Amino acid sequence: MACTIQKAEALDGAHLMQILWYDEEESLYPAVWLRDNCPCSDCYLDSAKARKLLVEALDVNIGIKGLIFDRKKVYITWPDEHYSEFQADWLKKRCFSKQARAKLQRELFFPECQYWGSELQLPTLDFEDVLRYDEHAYKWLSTLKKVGIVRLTGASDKPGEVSKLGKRMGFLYLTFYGHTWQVQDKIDANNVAYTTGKLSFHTDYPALHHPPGVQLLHCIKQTVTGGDSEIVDGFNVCQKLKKNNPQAFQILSSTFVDFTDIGVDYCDFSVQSKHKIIELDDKGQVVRINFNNATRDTIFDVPVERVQPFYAALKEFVDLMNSKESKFTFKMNPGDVITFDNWRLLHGRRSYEAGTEISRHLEGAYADWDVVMSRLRILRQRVEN
Ligand X SMILES: C[N+](C)(C)CCC[PH](=O)O
Size of the site for ligand 16D (CB under 6 A): 2
Q: Rounded to 5 degrees, what are φ and ψ at 379?
A: -65, -45
80 is a site residue for ligand 16D (CB under 6 A): no
Task: Choose between 49 and 243: whose C-beta lies nearer to its own copies.
Answer: 49
b/e per residue 97-133 (b: at least 16 CB within 10 A): eeeeeeeeeeeeebeeeeebbeebeebebebebbbee
In Å, the largest CA–CA distance within the chain is 83
Per-residue x/- track, 193-232, its own copies (CB under 8 A): --x-xx-x-------xxx----------------------
Of positions 161, 185, 204, 233, contacts ligand OGA by CB under 6 A: 204
The entry of ligand X, ligand 16D, Zn ion, none that residue 258 binds, CB within 5 to 8 Å by partner kind: none
CA distance 203 to 378: 28
CA distance 37 to 148: 37
The entry of Zn ion, ligand OGA, ligand X, none that residue 295 binds, CB within 5 to 8 Å by partner kind: ligand X
Q: In what order do the strands lie in the sheet with 149-153?
A: 124-126, 149-153, 337-341, 214-221, 361-367, 181-183
Strand partners, 29: 17
82 is in an annotated binding site: yes
171 is a site residue for its own copies (CB under 8 A): yes
Of positions 199, 232, 313, 314, contacts ligand OGA by CB under 6 A: 199
Residues 361-380 touching ligand OGA, rule: CB under 6 A, are 362, 364
DSSP string, 209-226: SS--SEEEEEEEE--SSS
Q: Are 141 and 339 in contact (CB under 8 A)?
A: no
349 is a site residue for ligand OGA (CB under 6 A): yes
Strand partners, 264: 268
Closest listed residue to residue 335, CA positions, set 126, 170, 193: 126
Per-residue x/- track, 244-263, ligand X (CB under 6 A): -----------------x--
Of positions 183, 214, 321, 345, contacts ligand OGA by CB under 6 A: 183
267 is in an annotated binding site: no
Q: CB of residue 370 vs ligand OGA: minimum separation in angstroms?
A: 18
75 is a site residue for ligand 16D (CB under 6 A): yes
341 is a site residue for Zn ion (CB under 5 A): no
Strand partners, 126: 153
171 is a site residue for ligand 16D (CB under 6 A): no
Per-residue x/- track, 158-197, ligand X (CB under 6 A): -------------------x---x-x-------x-x----
Q: Are 21 and 2 in contact (CB under 8 A)?
A: yes
Cα–chain center distance at 238: 17
Residues 138-167 touching ligand OGA, rule: CB under 6 A, are none
CA distance 87 to 34: 12
- On the CB side of 86, CA atoms within 13 Å amount to 28
Q: Are 63 and 79 in contact (CB under 8 A)?
A: yes
CA distance 247 to 199: 27
Size of the site for ligand OGA (CB under 6 A): 9
Q: CB of residue 366 vs ligand X: minimum separation in angstroms?
A: 8
Of positions 10, 52, 223, 331, contacts its own copies by CB under 8 A: 52
209 is in an annotated binding site: no
Cα–chain center distance at 355: 38
Specify burial of residue 285 (Cβ count, 10 A radius: 0-12, 13-18, 19+).
exposed
Of positions 23, 72, 247, 311, contacts its own copies by CB under 8 A: 311
The entry of its own copies, Zn ion, ligand X, none that residue 260 binds, CB within 5 to 8 Å by partner kind: its own copies
Q: CB of residue 309 vs ligand OGA: minimum separation in angstroms?
A: 28
Task: Choose between 68 and 104: whose C-beta lies nearer to Zn ion.
Answer: 68
Q: Name the residues that contact ligand 16D, by CB under 6 A.
A: 75, 83
Q: Name the residues that contact ligand X, by CB under 6 A.
A: 177, 181, 183, 191, 193, 204-205, 261, 292, 295, 364
| Binding-site residue ranges | 38, 40, 43, 82, 202, 204, 347
Q: Name the residues that contact Zn ion, by CB under 5 A.
A: 38, 40, 42-43, 204
Q: Name the residues that contact ligand OGA, by CB under 6 A.
A: 183, 193, 199, 204, 229, 347, 349, 362, 364
